[PDB]
Design a protein around this nucleic acid. Structure first.
Ligand SMILES: [K+]
Ligand SMILES: [K+]
Ligand SMILES: [K+]
Ligand SMILES: [K+]
Ligand SMILES: [K+]
Ligand SMILES: [K+]
Ligand SMILES: [K+]
Ligand SMILES: [K+]
Ligand SMILES: [K+]
Ligand SMILES: [K+]
Ligand SMILES: [K+]
Ligand SMILES: [K+]
Ligand SMILES: [K+]
Ligand SMILES: [K+]
Ligand SMILES: [K+]
Ligand SMILES: [K+]
Ligand SMILES: [K+]
Ligand SMILES: [K+]
Ligand SMILES: [K+]
Ligand SMILES: [K+]
Ligand SMILES: [K+]
Ligand SMILES: [K+]
Ligand SMILES: [K+]
Ligand SMILES: [K+]
Ligand SMILES: [K+]
Ligand SMILES: [K+]
Ligand SMILES: [K+]
Ligand SMILES: [K+]
Ligand SMILES: [K+]
Ligand SMILES: [K+]
Ligand SMILES: [K+]
Ligand SMILES: [K+]
Ligand SMILES: [Mg+2]
Ligand SMILES: [Mg+2]
Ligand SMILES: [Mg+2]
Ligand SMILES: [Mg+2]
Ligand SMILES: [Mg+2]
Ligand SMILES: [Mg+2]
Ligand SMILES: [Mg+2]
Ligand SMILES: [Mg+2]
Ligand SMILES: [Mg+2]
Ligand SMILES: [Mg+2]
Ligand SMILES: [Mg+2]
Ligand SMILES: [Mg+2]
Ligand SMILES: [Mg+2]
Ligand SMILES: [Mg+2]
Ligand SMILES: [Mg+2]
Ligand SMILES: [Mg+2]
Ligand SMILES: [Mg+2]
Ligand SMILES: [Mg+2]
Ligand SMILES: [Mg+2]
Ligand SMILES: [Mg+2]
Ligand SMILES: [Mg+2]
Ligand SMILES: [Mg+2]
Ligand SMILES: [Mg+2]
Ligand SMILES: [Mg+2]
Ligand SMILES: [Mg+2]
Ligand SMILES: [Mg+2]
Ligand SMILES: [Mg+2]
Ligand SMILES: [Mg+2]
Ligand SMILES: [Mg+2]
Ligand SMILES: [Mg+2]
Ligand SMILES: [Mg+2]
Ligand SMILES: [Mg+2]
Ligand SMILES: [Mg+2]
Ligand SMILES: [Mg+2]
Ligand SMILES: [Mg+2]
Ligand SMILES: [Mg+2]
Ligand SMILES: [Mg+2]
Ligand SMILES: [Mg+2]
Lengths: 173, 159, 217
RNA sequence: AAAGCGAAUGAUUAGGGACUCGGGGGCGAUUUUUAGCCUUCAUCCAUUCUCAAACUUUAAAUAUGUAAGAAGCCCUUGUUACUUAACUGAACGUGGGCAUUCGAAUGUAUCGACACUAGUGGGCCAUUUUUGGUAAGCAGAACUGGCGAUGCGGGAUGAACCGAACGCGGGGUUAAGGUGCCGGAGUGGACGCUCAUCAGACACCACAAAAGGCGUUAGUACAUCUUGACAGCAGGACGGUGGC
RNA sequence: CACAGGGAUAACUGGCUUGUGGCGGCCAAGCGUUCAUAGCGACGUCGCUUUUUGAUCCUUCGAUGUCGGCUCUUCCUAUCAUACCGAAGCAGAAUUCGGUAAGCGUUGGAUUGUUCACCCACUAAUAGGGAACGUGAGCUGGGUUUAGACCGUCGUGAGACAGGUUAGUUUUACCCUACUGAUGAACUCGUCGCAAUGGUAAUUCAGCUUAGUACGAGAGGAACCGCUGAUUCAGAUAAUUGGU
C-alpha cells in the first residue's frame, strides 16, 4: 500500500508559431499524485526541451491491476548508480501485481547493493507469459512440478507480557 | 594604503568594444536637453574632457543645468547609513536620454482617451494594471494528435 | 629534493604557467608524446583503446614519463615496432612551488619563520578532470588483448582511480565505425598524412571536384 | 562561472603537399644552379593532440541604477536686460478642462525634525566564495548567521552544532532526539545482507590508504552442451612415411 | 644595576601538524652462470610513528628549580640472546629470510663535564625506547649562566664575543593523601579449622659420553637420551673458617 502506478500526460504550452503541441505519456510509480507529477517533469526534462514553467499537465489517472488474484512472474529492467559509475541490471520477481513487484525491487536493491530510491531508473516492467521465459534459478525452483515442503523448527507465538512460563515450549507446530 | 587613482580598475569599463573604434556618430551632438529630463550616463573612452568618475558610469539621474556643451545631473549616492545628493558636470558625449519613463508617459495619455471614450459612451473600464492570473479551464482534443509514450534510456559509453 | 607526491595531489591553486612573470622553471620530465609506427594510414589501425581518469587531481611529469615507458616496452615486446601507435594526451603546464626553510634560513639566517614565504618553482604537473582521456592506442583488431594488458600494467604508476574504455569509433577519428565506412564508400574522404580530410560541399566547384574526384562521378 | 584556440596576442605534439636557391650532406664527368639524381633541416599551404591570475571573438546565475501621477495631463496667452533673421524659444504663471475610476501586489505590530550625553574603539567561530603555506586547534579577506552579553531539550561530557530563545502556576500537543536494562516509551511489524582467534553499532567528532581473497551474495559479456557438454573410469590410437 | 607592568611577547614540559628525520608497503625494467620475485628492486607510487629538527604561540612572567651522571620501580615491541617452528642458489659446519612469542637477561674498563662517540676484554648476548626530553625539601655541582681576574680579535672610549682559561653559600616537612610496618571499639571468653579474594619465580652455560660417528672426493665435522658441575636470582641458617 506504499506505491501506486499512474498515467501522466503532459504538453508544452501552446504558442502562435506552434498551436496544438505534441502530447507525451509516461507510467510512474509513486506514493501519491503530488510526487507523481514531480517525477514526470524530472524524466521529461532529460528527453525533450520542456520545463514545468513552460508546460502544463493534461491528465492524471490511476492504473489498477486487472487480476489481483492470479500469481504471476515479472521481469524488470533498471539502471542505477553505484559509488563509482552506472550500470544496467535485470531481475525477476513472483507476486500478484505490478505494484507488488516494484515494491519488492526497491527493498531488494537497498539490501544487496545499498542503492537508494534517488539513484534508480525503471526502464520496463513485463509479465512473463510462458514458463520457458524464466531465467533466474531462484524463481525456477518455485515453478517446479508438484511442489511441497514442511516447516521445521517453528517457534510458537507467546505474548510478550507473559513472563515466567511453567513449562518448556516445543517447536513442532 | 593601496593605490587609489581616479581611473583605477577601469580597464574594461572605459574601453570601446570590438570593431567599434574610430569615428563618433554625429547624431550624438544633435539631441536637445531641458531642465527636468531623465538621462543615463555612459562614459565614452575616446573623449577625455568632461569625463565623470567611474562611480557614475551606469547610473540614471535628472538634469538641473544646461550650458554650451554640457549638462548638470543630480544623483543620489549611498554612504553607509544615509544618502547624499551629488551634482556632476558631464559633456553630452557621455549622456543619453532614457526610456525609463516612456512606459509611464504612454499609459497616461492612453488612460485619458479610454476614460473620455467610456464617459461619452457610458460603460466603466479598468484603467489600472493587474498581475498575471492563474489559467482557466479548457478542453484538449486527442483527434489526430495521439500521445507518444516515453521511457528512460539505458546507460552507454560515448567516447 | 623531490618531496613525496602526496604533498601535491589536489588542485588547490589557480593555474600558474611559466610566462614573463615567473622565470626560472625547470624543463619538464616528459618530452615525447607519439610512439610506435606513428605514420600508418587510417585504414591500417581500426581499433582504439583509451585510459580515462576518474578523479579531479594533479599528475606529475615524472609519473607521465614513467607510465609512457612502461606501456611502450610491453607493446614492442608482444606486438612489434610497427603494430601500434601510442599517443599521450595530457600536457603538464601548471608549476608548483616550494618554500625552502633550510636553504633560506638554515646556516643562512637572514629571516626565519613564516615571514616572506612566497616560494620558488620546483616542478610541473597536469591538471585533469573526471572523464578526461590520458593515453590512447590504435592498432589492429587482432591485438585487442595486448592493448588491454599494456594499459592495465601502466596505471600502477598513477595516483587515484583510472578506467580503460574500448572506443566505438574508427581509429583516432570522431566517427563511428559503420558511418565511416559509408562515407568512404560514397567517396567523401581523402587520405592525408596518417589522417583524413572531409568534403563539405560549400567551396568553389572546381577545387572540390579536383580533390574528391570519386564523389562527383 | 562556464566557453575558445581548423579566431588576434602568448604556450604546445605529430604527420602530409608544395617547393631550391635558404642552409647541410652528398651521387650521374663533386664538372657546373646542370633547382640533372637525390637527400635532412628551414619556409609556405590545408589538417592534427593539449593550455592561460596579470589572454580573448562570445557570455550566465546571484546581486545592482531609475520609474509606476494631482508638485499629473491638456487648451488659450502675460513679463524679461537671456536666446532667435524674427514674440522664434527658455524658465516662471493667470484663466479653463479632466475621478462616470487619483491610474501594479502586500504590509503599515510604530511618521518627521531637534537637543544633551554614556559605554566601546584587544574579538573569536561556522556554511558557501577565497589568498600564503607540505600542513596546522596556523596567518589573512567578502556576504550572511552566531558566541561574547544566554538560560532550556538533545549530541554520555563538550562557549560556537541540531531544536528552540525565558514573568508566577494548572491541563493538552509536539520539535531535535529516542522506546532490551541503567531510563520515561516496542525484546513492535515486512524483505534481505553479515560469522570477524582485531566483528559492528549514527552528522559536526574525536582517523585510516594504495594493493589483494576459489569467504559469501547479486550482476555484465563471450563461448560449449540432450545431434549427449565439464569430472572420473574404460578401450583404441592405422600405409606410403625411417618424409624430402 | 633600579621601578611600573605584560603570559597582548621569546628562552624549557604539554597541545595541533609532519616538511625534514625514522620505520613499512604496491608494481615490475633489471641483477642474480640459465632463471623478474632463494636473496634483491631502477623509473614511479601509498602509508605509519612522535625517542630528530623545523613551523605556530593555546596554558604558565604577584616564579611549575633550567645539562649530565649515580640510585630505584614499572611499561612498549619495530626481537640482540634463550624456547618451538616454516624457507634457501639449506650435503655436513657456519650463515641468510620469515612466523608465534616481551616469560627471563642484556656487563668490567682507558680519554672526555659530557648526551653522542672510539678503543681494550669477557660473554648466550653485550637490542631500541617511554614515564613533565621519569627522577635537586633524593644526592652531587664537573659544565652552563651574576659579582673578582688573564689572553686573542673588535671598538677613540665606556665596553662586546652562542672564543679559550682560573676561583665562586644548593634553604624548610611536625600538616593531607600515597606507601611500608604496628594497635584497635561493638556482638561472653577461649581452642581447633575452612578458603573468597590479592601476590607469585627461577635463569643461562660448560665438561664427559654419543663420536672423529652421521654427511662429505677431501679438507672438515653435528644432534636426542644419559651423568657431573658452574653463572645470575630468591628464601633461610651459624657446627666449622673469618670480621667485630
Ligand atoms: K597594487
Ligand atoms: K624573529
Ligand atoms: K592508479
Ligand atoms: K566561447
Ligand atoms: K591561439
Ligand atoms: K533591473
Ligand atoms: K525677444
Ligand atoms: K561616543
Ligand atoms: K570614542
Ligand atoms: K587580540
Ligand atoms: K586563531
Ligand atoms: K549540551
Ligand atoms: K523482533
Ligand atoms: K567479492
Ligand atoms: K601573569
Ligand atoms: K591568559
Ligand atoms: K613524516
Ligand atoms: K615528539
Ligand atoms: K614537534
Ligand atoms: K610557549
Ligand atoms: K613565567
Ligand atoms: K657514568
Ligand atoms: K615541569
Ligand atoms: K637533573
Ligand atoms: K669553569
Ligand atoms: K677558593
Ligand atoms: K608529611
Ligand atoms: K592470579
Ligand atoms: K603458585
Ligand atoms: K643473607
Ligand atoms: K654461634
Ligand atoms: K666472634
Ligand atoms: Mg585596486
Ligand atoms: Mg588636459
Ligand atoms: Mg593556495
Ligand atoms: Mg575559466
Ligand atoms: Mg584597549
Ligand atoms: Mg583566522
Ligand atoms: Mg592569533
Ligand atoms: Mg569582554
Ligand atoms: Mg544562544
Ligand atoms: Mg544538556
Ligand atoms: Mg559524542
Ligand atoms: Mg506543561
Ligand atoms: Mg526504532
Ligand atoms: Mg521502562
Ligand atoms: Mg579496496
Ligand atoms: Mg568429456
Ligand atoms: Mg612583574
Ligand atoms: Mg599566549
Ligand atoms: Mg619522509
Ligand atoms: Mg637477466
Ligand atoms: Mg624506490
Ligand atoms: Mg603560579
Ligand atoms: Mg614542583
Ligand atoms: Mg615553588
Ligand atoms: Mg610482533
Ligand atoms: Mg626471530
Ligand atoms: Mg668508571
Ligand atoms: Mg619527547
Ligand atoms: Mg627530566
Ligand atoms: Mg623531585
Ligand atoms: Mg662550577
Ligand atoms: Mg664572571
Ligand atoms: Mg668590575
Ligand atoms: Mg685597540
Ligand atoms: Mg636543594
Ligand atoms: Mg589465586
Ligand atoms: Mg666415509
Ligand atoms: Mg673467631
Amino acid at each position: 500500500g506504499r506505491l501506486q502506478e499512474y498515467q501522466v500526460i503532459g504538453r508544452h504550452l501552446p504558442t502562435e508559431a506552434n498551436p496544438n503541441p505534441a502530447l507525451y505519456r509516461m507510467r510512474i510509480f509513486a506514493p501519491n499524485e503530488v510526487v507523481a507529477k514531480s517525477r514526470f517533469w524530472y524524466f521529461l526534462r532529460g528527453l525533450k526541451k520542456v520545463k514545468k514553467a513552460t508546460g502544463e499537465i493534461v491528465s492524471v489517472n490511476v492504473i489498477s491491476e486487472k487480476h489481483p488474484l492470479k500469481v504471476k512472474n515479472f521481469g524488470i529492467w533498471l539502471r542505477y548508480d553505484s559509488r563509482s559509475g552506472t550500470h544496467n541490471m535485470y531481475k525477476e520477481y513472483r507476486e500478484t501485481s505490478r505494484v507488488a513487484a516494484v515494491e519488492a525491487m526497491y527493498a531488494d536493491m537497498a539490501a544487496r547493493h545499498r542503492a537508494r530510491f534517488r539513484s534508480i531508473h525503471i526502464l520496463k516492467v513485463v509479465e512473463l507469459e510462458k514458463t520457458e521465459d524464466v531465467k533466474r534459478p531462484y524463481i525456477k525452483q518455485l515453478v517446479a512440478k508438484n511442489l511441497s515442503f514442511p516447516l521445521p523448527h517453528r517457534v510458537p507465538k507467546i505474548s510478550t507480557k507473559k513472563i515466567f512460563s511453567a513449562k518448556r515450549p516445543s517447536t513442532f507446530s | 594604503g593601496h593605490a587609489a587613482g581616479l581611473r583605477s580598475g577601469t580597464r574594461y569599463a572605459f574601453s570601446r568594444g570590438f570593431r567599434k573604434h574610430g569615428q563618433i556618430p554625429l547624431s550624438t551632438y544633435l539631441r536637445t536637453y531641458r531642465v527636468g529630463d531623465i538621462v543615463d550616463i555612459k562614459v565614452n573612452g575616446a573623449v577625455q574632457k568632461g569625463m565623470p568618475h567611474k562611480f557614475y558610469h551606469g547610473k540614471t539621474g535628472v538634469v538641473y543645468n544646461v550650458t554650451k556643451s554640457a549638462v548638470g545631473v543630480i544623483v543620489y549616492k549611498r554612504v553607509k547609513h544615509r544618502y547624499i545628493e551629488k551634482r556632476i558636470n558631464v559633456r553630452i558625449e557621455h549622456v543619453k536620454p532614457s526610456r525609463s519613463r516612456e512606459d509611464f508617459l504612454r499609459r497616461v495619455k492612453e488612460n485619458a482617451e479610454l476614460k473620455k471614450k467610456a464617459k461619452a459612451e457610458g460603460v466603466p473600464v479598468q484603467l489600472k494594471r493587474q498581475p498575471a492570473m492563474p489559467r482557466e479551464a479548457h478542453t484538449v482534443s486527442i483527434a489526430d494528435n495521439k500521445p507518444v509514450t516515453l521511457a528512460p534510456v539505458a546507460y552507454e559509453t560515448t567516447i | 629534493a623531490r618531496r613525496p607526491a602526496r604533498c601535491y595531489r589536489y588542485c588547490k591553486n589557480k593555474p600558474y604557467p611559466k610566462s614573463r612573470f615567473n622565470r626560472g622553471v625547470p624543463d619538464p620530465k616528459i618530452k615525447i608524446y607519439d610512439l610506435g609506427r606513428k605514420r600508418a594510414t587510417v585504414d591500417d589501425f581500426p581499433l582504439c583503446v583509451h585510459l580515462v581518469s576518474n578523479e579531479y587531481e594533479q599528475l606529475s611529469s615524472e609519473a607521465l614519463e614513467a607510465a609512457r615507458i612502461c606501456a611502450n616496452k610491453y607493446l614492442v615486446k608482444y606486438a612489434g615496432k610497427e603494430g601500434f601507435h601510442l599517443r599521450v594526451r595530457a600536457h603538464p603546464y601548471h608549476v608548483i612551488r616550494i618554500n625552502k626553510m633550510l636553504s633560506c634560513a638554515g646556516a643562512d639566517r637572514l629571516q626565519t619563520g613564516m615571514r616572506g614565504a612566497f616560494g620558488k618553482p620546483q616542478g610541473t604537473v597536469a591538471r585533469v578532470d573526471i572523464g578526461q582521456i590520458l593515453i590512447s592506442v590504435r592498432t589492429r583488431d587482432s591485438n585487442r588483448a595486448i592493448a588491454l594488458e599494456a594499459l592495465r600494467r601502466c596505471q600502477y604508476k598513477f595516483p587515484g582511480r583510472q578506467k580503460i574504455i574500448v572506443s566505438k569509433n574508427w581509429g583516432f577519428t570522431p566517427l563511428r565505425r559503420e558511418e565511416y565506412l559509408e562515407k568512404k564508400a560514397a567517396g567523401r574522404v581523402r587520405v592525408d598524412g596518417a589522417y583524413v580530410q572531409f568534403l563539405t560541399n560549400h567551396g568553389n566547384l572546381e577545387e572540390n571536384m579536383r580533390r574528391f574526384p570519386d564523389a562527383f562521378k
